[PDB]
Design a protein around this ligand. Structure first.
Ligand SMILES: Nc1ncc(-c2ccc(CCO)cc2)nc1C(=O)Nc1cnccc1N1CCOCC1
Length: 303
């Protein structure tokens, strides 16, 4: 018995929930693991996320480490499990709400997020390669902060994979699946072309620029920083509808405000420029995750 299995895992603490499935801190052969638990009626969601997590060549330091998909029968009902590495800090949302970061801290968070997304989006051609994956629900609540102060992306149930040979998407995607606040303009107004996989990669970039805005607010220089806020906190209610978002992002064409103090620091200037270049209404004009990783790597080298 070498491989990690459900019957050997002991749940210790409930830590949160996804759209479906509750996340627990568990102990497996003396080590901490995260267990995402789904009910029998949530099999499709569980299966889909296990399917994404099992994608060939997916493992990357900035992608949540998958361990196993399993079942657990308690004698009354069956639970469907997704076991992964456990990241004590939780999500970027929790971390940024609790702490401010330095210039170095900010670049580590932004660069690691961009590196994970670049790896996700990257297609390695051939049967022994890797299909391109688009997240479709990227947000600060879906990005985990590791002990070393770097990020890893989780919550892949809404993801879509591209097959280069057939030039097709592995599923028939439903429209407007993600978090309304982070939905790209083309997703909000339904102009998105669901037949082109590049559309999904471009909508993930938009959401990442919003996440960078959340990080940059918390970068403290000389003890000066902004308070924690979700993007569009100044324009929409909590739990905004698609129409509330669409009126702001598409009709009025507003983006989160870029403060005057971000022009005073080079790291903040580079971050502010990436943001504007992720926020174009035209998806084709946005930066790629690979290009962002390259720009931030250069900035990390220099600092
Ligand atoms: N691997 C992990 N390791 C640790 C933790 C964790 C650690 C601490 C806390 C804060 C408690 O006060 C919460 C959660 N979560 C995950 C995880 O994959 N979570 C996860 C996966 N899919 C959807 C939503 C998720 N959550 C993101 C974090 O917030 C809850 C939702």
């Amino acid at each position: 018995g070498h491989m990690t299995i459900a019957r050997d895992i002991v749940l210790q603490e409930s830590v949160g929930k996804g759209r479906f499935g509750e996340v627990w801190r568990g102990k497996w052969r003396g080590e901490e693991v995260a267990v995402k638990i789904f009910s029998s009626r949530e099999e499709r969601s569980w299966f889909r996320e296990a399917e994404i997590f099992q994608t060939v060549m997916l493992r990357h330091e900035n992608i949540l480490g998958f361990i196993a998909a399993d079942n657990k029968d308690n004698g009354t009902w069956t639970q469907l499990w997704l076991v992964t590495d456990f990241h004590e800090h939780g999500n970027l949302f929790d971390y940024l709400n609790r702490y401010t970061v330095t210039v170095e801290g900010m670049i580590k968070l932004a660069l690691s997020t961009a590196s994970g997304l670049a790896h996700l989006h990257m297609e390695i051609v051939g049967t022994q390669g890797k299909p391109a994956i688009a997240h479709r629900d990227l947000k600060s609540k879906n990005i985990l902060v590791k002990k070393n102060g770097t990020c890893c992306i989780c919550d892949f149930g809404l993801a879509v994979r591209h097959d280069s040979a057939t030039d097709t998407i592995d599923i028939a995607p439903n429209h407007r699946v993600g978090t309304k606040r982070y939905m790209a303009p083309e997703v909000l107004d339904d102009s998105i072309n669901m037949k082109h996989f590049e559309s999904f990669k471009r909508a993930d970039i938009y959401a990442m620029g919003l996440v960078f805005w959340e990080i940059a607010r918390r970068c403290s220089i000389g003890g000066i920083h902004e308070d924690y806020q979700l993007p569009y906190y100044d324009l929409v209610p909590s739990d905004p509808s698609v129409e509330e978002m669409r009126k702001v992002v598409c009709e009025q064409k507003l983006r989160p405000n870029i403060p005057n103090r971000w022009q005073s620091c080079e790291a903040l200037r580079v971050m502010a420029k990436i943001m504007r270049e992720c926020w174009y209404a035209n998806g084709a004009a946005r930066l790629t995750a690979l290009r962002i990783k390259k720009t931030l790597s250069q900035l990390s080298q220099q600092e």
